[PDB]
Design a protein around this motif. Structure first.
Motif, PDB file in Angstrom:
ATOM      1  N   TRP A 125       0.818  -1.207   0.000  1.00 34.41           N
ATOM      2  CA  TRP A 125       0.000   0.000   0.000  1.00 34.41           C
ATOM      3  C   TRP A 125       0.856   1.263   0.000  1.00 34.41           C
ATOM      4  CZ3 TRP A 125      -0.979   4.340   2.914  1.00 34.41           C
ATOM      5  CH2 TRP A 125      -2.203   4.990   2.726  1.00 34.41           C
ATOM      6  N   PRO A 173      -3.894   8.264   8.468  1.00 38.10           N
ATOM      7  CA  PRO A 173      -3.424   9.519   9.044  1.00 38.10           C
ATOM      8  C   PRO A 173      -4.416  10.052  10.063  1.00 38.10           C
ATOM      9  CG  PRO A 173      -4.020   9.811   6.741  1.00 38.10           C
ATOM     10  CD  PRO A 173      -4.227   8.381   7.043  1.00 38.10           C
ATOM     11  N   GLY A 174      -3.894  10.534  11.183  1.00 39.94           N
ATOM     12  CA  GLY A 174      -4.709  11.059  12.285  1.00 39.94           C
ATOM     13  C   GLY A 174      -5.341  10.033  13.201  1.00 39.94           C
ATOM     14  N   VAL A 175      -5.080   8.746  12.965  1.00 40.74           N
ATOM     15  CA  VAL A 175      -5.680   7.691  13.780  1.00 40.74           C
ATOM     16  C   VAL A 175      -4.688   7.335  14.899  1.00 40.74           C
ATOM     17  CG1 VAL A 175      -6.737   5.414  13.785  1.00 40.74           C
ATOM     18  CG2 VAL A 175      -6.807   6.822  11.715  1.00 40.74           C
ATOM     19  N   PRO A 176      -5.069   7.564  16.164  1.00 36.71           N
ATOM     20  CA  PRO A 176      -4.226   7.140  17.267  1.00 36.71           C
ATOM     21  C   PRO A 176      -4.453   5.667  17.652  1.00 36.71           C
ATOM     22  CG  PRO A 176      -6.048   8.332  18.097  1.00 36.71           C
ATOM     23  CD  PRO A 176      -6.258   8.281  16.644  1.00 36.71           C
ATOM     24  N   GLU A 212      -7.906   3.990  18.630  1.00 31.13           N
ATOM     25  CA  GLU A 212      -8.808   3.998  17.495  1.00 31.13           C
ATOM     26  C   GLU A 212      -8.418   2.919  16.498  1.00 31.13           C
ATOM     27  OE1 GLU A 212     -11.497   5.655  17.780  1.00 31.13           O
ATOM     28  OE2 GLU A 212     -11.030   7.220  19.251  1.00 31.13           O
ATOM     29  N   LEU A 224     -10.597   0.064  14.814  1.00 27.54           N
ATOM     30  CA  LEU A 224     -10.724  -0.240  13.384  1.00 27.54           C
ATOM     31  C   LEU A 224     -10.387  -1.718  13.092  1.00 27.54           C
ATOM     32  CD1 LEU A 224      -9.075   2.894  11.600  1.00 27.54           C
ATOM     33  CD2 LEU A 224     -11.525   2.261  11.643  1.00 27.54           C
ATOM     34  N   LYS A 273      -8.584   0.879  -1.503  1.00 32.54           N
ATOM     35  CA  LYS A 273      -7.701   0.720  -2.626  1.00 32.54           C
ATOM     36  C   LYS A 273      -7.124   2.075  -2.999  1.00 32.54           C
ATOM     37  CE  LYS A 273      -8.383   0.035  -7.543  1.00 32.54           C
ATOM     38  N   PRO A 274      -5.793   2.156  -3.225  1.00 31.44           N
ATOM     39  CA  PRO A 274      -5.241   3.410  -3.725  1.00 31.44           C
ATOM     40  C   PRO A 274      -5.661   3.588  -5.163  1.00 31.44           C
ATOM     41  CG  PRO A 274      -3.500   2.013  -2.863  1.00 31.44           C
ATOM     42  CD  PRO A 274      -4.730   1.158  -3.022  1.00 31.44           C
ATOM     43  N   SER A 275      -5.687   4.838  -5.615  1.00 30.81           N
ATOM     44  CA  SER A 275      -5.856   5.147  -7.029  1.00 30.81           C
ATOM     45  C   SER A 275      -4.525   4.828  -7.673  1.00 30.81           C
ATOM     46  CB  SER A 275      -6.188   6.622  -7.237  1.00 30.81           C
ATOM     47  OG  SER A 275      -5.054   7.432  -6.959  1.00 30.81           O
ATOM     48  N   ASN A 276      -4.552   4.354  -8.904  1.00 38.58           N
ATOM     49  CA  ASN A 276      -3.319   3.908  -9.548  1.00 38.58           C
ATOM     50  C   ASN A 276      -2.858   2.637  -8.836  1.00 38.58           C
ATOM     51  OD1 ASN A 276      -2.400   6.367 -11.536  1.00 38.58           O
ATOM     52  ND2 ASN A 276      -3.495   7.103  -9.690  1.00 38.58           N
ATOM     53  N   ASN A 283      -6.994  -3.822  -9.688  1.00 36.87           N
ATOM     54  CA  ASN A 283      -7.739  -4.619  -8.708  1.00 36.87           C
ATOM     55  C   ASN A 283      -7.103  -5.940  -8.212  1.00 36.87           C
ATOM     56  OD1 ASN A 283     -10.370  -3.801  -6.866  1.00 36.87           O
ATOM     57  ND2 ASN A 283      -9.681  -2.250  -8.354  1.00 36.87           N
TER      58      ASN A 283
END
Ligand SMILES: COCCCc1cc(Nc2nc(NCc3cc(C)no3)ncc2Br)[nH]n1
Ligand SMILES: COCCCc1cc(Nc2nc(NCc3cc(C)no3)ncc2Br)[nH]n1
Lengths: 272, 278
Positions: free
Chosen positions: A202, A213-216, A219, A223, A232-235, A238
């Motif tokens: 990834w 980002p921003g997830v401590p 949290e 998740l 999924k990232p762009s570029n 699948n």
């Protein structure tokens, strides 16, 4: 180890044949410097040297020795940082290892946001090769991440920190590369490193992106328990996203192996 | 109490109340002559205060002034005399857009690229209309967009009374999400709400559409959100999204409010993109 270390003539380098140079980076009670080694007959080789900091303890020494000794047992592979030698006698321990001039893969990718889709898959292939090798040698990394992959002048990927001996310690959070079993159950396997490779994948396809980002910490747990999976990232094909998702199976036995991942990436590279 | 308004009053006996929708109930209105129309009806709960009545009346009066557009939830009538206040409004059978998109994720029938761009166009049209009538939404999100049976997007909650100097930033929505994640920085930090901050929120909604009901900033609590915004953090491009539509989101999230596109511009751009989208 207090007054003298054991000698290993297979690996010992004369200190007069090593000229220490500019520092590359440091850590808790260890540090890495660029150096020049003569005759590892009379050719200079740019090497990296790892050594203790001046505030290190006996246990730091014992850690560094164990790292060097693991590097010996594991042996050589192109996609890992290789042991080239050591100064162990008559002064501080210098563990001499290969130099990767382009630094870590995170930075490498970020500074090129110029790599092609093939090059990106090739990076991923080389990393899994290195991991397939290490896993054949009973080596579990436990912190596989782009920050621990170094890149050479000739763009070879080389896994580092594979021989090393607080969830809130960061400026990103390593817990974000840990398998659920490793994080929740302290189960470390080769399959738990497969999960970590998933996140590296990834990172690769976001060209150095920051997971969550921003997830401590608390949290992130939340998740994980919810079966959350990064989008999924762009570029990113699948196929590749399903490779990542596969690496991110909750059951480690259903994750692919590094052997399987090398086979797939070899195929994928050729078809990119 | 309530003053009579002949423009809107429906007799109580003309409204057949049905199932709860989520207070809002499904109903049938006879007439609005011998035809029944399905309608949604908003009314007070049992434990409601006079302040709640006041706020419901204000919402209704605001709808009267704003007038009708295809892409908003339109007022149809009211029962105000001799019993509970019922505000009668258009019925959207397929629910909110967040759920509509998530149900249509691949494993209900999938949405084409054009279908998604068309959702975006219709919401922007509704917003352009509301902007034209001097109305600032203040909580534009996919959850406040409702979908009709013929797949028409209608904006909801545009006329709502809110005291902005009493917002709980920590309060989650029923789905588990935090409304602060749709708010322009200047609205969030400075409580300054404009059409421009609504455009910011539209950028987030566009993101929600192209991730098929995705949750912004998943697992990011309120304090960390602030810190991402102060640092100029922007969400990554959804997969299966053109560069051109991601540039639109980014434009909507311009740090300088004057430099964001208007809904008038967004409407024109999206119209162009809809026609060229497969
Ligand atoms: C025990 O081997 C550690 C890696 C040896 C090494 C380092 C480099 N080149 C660079 N190294 C650093 N930081 C030191 C470092 C990074 C990691 C991971 N571990 O140590 N910065 C920049 C460069 Br270029 N080559 N080989
Ligand atoms: C006064 O405007 C209220 C929205 C009128 C409305 C609601 C629906 N359809 C559905 N509504 C709900 N929940 C009530 C709700 C949602 C929002 C936004 N506001 O109130 N659940 C399911 C459906 Br289908 N049509 N018209």
């Amino acid at each position: 180890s207090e007054y003298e270390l054991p000698e290993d003539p297979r690996w010992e380098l004369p200190r007069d044949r090593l000229v220490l140079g500019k520092p590359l980076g440091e850590g808790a009670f260890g540090q890495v410097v660029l150096a020049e080694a003569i005759g590892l007959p009379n050719r200079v080789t740019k090497v990296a040297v790892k050594m203790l900091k001046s505030d290190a303890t006996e246990k730091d020494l014992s850690d560094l020795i164990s790292e060097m000794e693991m590097m010996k047992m594991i042996g050589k592979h192109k996609n890992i940082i290789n042991l080239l030698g050591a100064c162990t006698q008559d002064g501080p321990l210098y563990v001499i290892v290969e130099y990767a001039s382009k630094g870590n893969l995170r930075e490498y990718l970020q500074a090129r946001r110029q790599l092609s889709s093939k090059d990106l898959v090739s990076c991923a292939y080389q990393v899994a090769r290195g991991m397939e090798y290490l896993a054949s040698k009973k080596c579990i990394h436990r912190d596989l991440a782009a920050r621990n992959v170094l890149v050479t002048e000739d763009n070879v990927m080389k896994i580092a920190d594979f021989g090393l001996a607080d969830y809130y310690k960061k400026g990103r959070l390593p817990v974000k590369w840990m398998a659920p079993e490793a994080l929740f159950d302290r189960i470390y396997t080769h399959q738990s490193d497969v999960w970590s490779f998933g996140v590296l994948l990834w990172e690769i396809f976001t060209l150095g992106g920051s997971p969550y980002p921003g997830v401590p910490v608390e949290e992130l747990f939340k998740l994980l328990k919810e079966g959350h999976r990064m989008d999924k990232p762009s570029n990113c094909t699948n196929e590749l996203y399903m490779m990542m998702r596969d690496c991110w199976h909750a059951v480690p036995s259903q994750r692919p192996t590094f052997k399987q991942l090398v086979e797939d990436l070899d195929r994928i590279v050729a078809l990119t």
